[PDB]
Design a protein around this ligand. Structure first.
Ligand SMILES: *[C@@H]1O[C@H](CO)[C@@H](O)[C@H](O)[C@H]1NC(C)=O
Lengths: 39, 49
């Protein structure tokens, strides 16, 4: 969808929370509590 | 092997990088997409070819 400033990208595979687009969904997980943007 | 029913070319094939079937490859080839903004295309619009 585009370039994603903020959060990060982990290789973990959790269920789809708030979805970004093209198969990427963010969340608010512990893995220093912050925002991640996983696949 | 499933009974005798040929289930090739309806199932994903790992030879292709995408997991679409051969029948699904035909279905994707015949429907001529407009090549919309699902992929990034500002670099293509800037790179005038
Ligand atoms: C159809 O499926 C059977 C299942 O064993 C296979 O033996 C055969 O080669 C297949 N034919 C084609 C044309 O894919």
């Amino acid at each position: 969808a585009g370039c994603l400033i903020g959060a990060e990208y982990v290789n973990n595979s959790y269920e789809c929370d708030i979805p970004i687009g093209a198969g990427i969904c963010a969340s608010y997980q512990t893995q220093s509590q912050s925002i991640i943007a996983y696949t | 092997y499933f009974g005798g029913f040929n289930f090739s070319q309806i199932l994903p094939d790992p030879s292709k990088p995408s997991k679409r079937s051969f029948i699904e490859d035909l279905l994707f080839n015949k429907v001529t997409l407009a090549d919309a903004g699902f992929i990034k295309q500002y670099g293509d619009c800037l790179g005038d070819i």
